[PDB]
Amino acid sequence: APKAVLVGLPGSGKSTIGRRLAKALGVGLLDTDVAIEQRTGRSIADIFATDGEQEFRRIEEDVVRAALADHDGVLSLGGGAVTSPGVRAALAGHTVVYLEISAAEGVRRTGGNTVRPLLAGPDRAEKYRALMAKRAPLYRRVATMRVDTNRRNPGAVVRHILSRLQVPSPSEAAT
Ligand SMILES: O=C(O)C1=C[C@@H](O)[C@@H](O)[C@H](O)C1
Ligand SMILES: [Cl-]
């Protein structure tokens, strides 16, 4: 079972944090969005467009359940997986790290490299805020470790997690 399952919104640093955490632990990194494409040979968008949302979610849940069973390292969950009741059920009992950010912080961090993100109009930021209002309550439900990542360097976030994922040395009996 995974050392840590990472959840959060775009802008939470989830990709970078996952890689860095896996590097520090020396464990494998499995991203469920990548795994779905590797197992189907179809892009995320293609699946949505042809089989529909519900079928994408069923495929994703199968992938997530298999990873929870078989993967020992860091598991990075796609951003909509927790909308599936079966995924929230399957997570119970796992170590689930929620990289928590505010709506304002998320909007800032998903603006990209343009200097004047406001000039493109409010629609993208409004859709982001809507997404956070829907997703954040579900991430708080499934979390076992909430980590405030607002204005923190990704290395500090990794240290915070590592200090709360320590494993004692085994006894003689265990060895
Ligand atoms: O927010 C979502 O529901 C999604 C997030 C991505 O990680 C992908 O799993 C896909 O684009 C759906
Ligand atoms: Cl690091």
UniProtKB/Swiss-Prot annotation:
Protein name: Shikimate kinase
Catalyses which reaction(s): shikimate + ATP = 3-phosphoshikimate + ADP + H(+)
One GO cellular component term: cytosol
Classification via InterPro entries: P-loop_NTPase, Shikimate/glucono_kinase, Shikimate_kinase/TSH1, Shikimate_kinase_CS
Domain of life: Bacteria
A GO molecular function held by the record: ATP binding
Record has Ribonucleoprotein as a keyword: no
Residues annotated as binding ATP: 11-16, 116, 152
Keyword terms of this UniProt record: Amino-acid biosynthesis, Aromatic amino acid biosynthesis, ATP-binding, Cytoplasm, Kinase, Magnesium, Metal-binding, Nucleotide-binding, Transferase
Residues reported in the UniProt entry to bind substrate: 33, 57, 79, 135
Quaternary state and interactors: Monomer.
EC number(s) reported in the record: 2.7.1.71
Domain description: Consists of three domains: the CORE domain which forms the binding site for nucleotides, the LID domain which closes over the active site upon ATP or shikimate binding, and the substrate-binding domain which functions to recognize and bind shikimate.
Other facts noted in the record for this chain: The phosphoryl transfer proceeds by an in-line associative mechanism. The random sequential binding of shikimate and nucleotide is associated with domain movements that suggest a synergic mechanism by which binding of the first substrate may enhance the affinity for the second substrate. Was identified as a high-confidence drug target.
Required co-factors: Mg(2+)
Subcellular localization, as worded in the UniProt entry: Cytoplasm
Gene3D superfamilies attached to this UniProt entry: P-loop containing nucleotide triphosphate hydrolases
Main location: cytoplasm
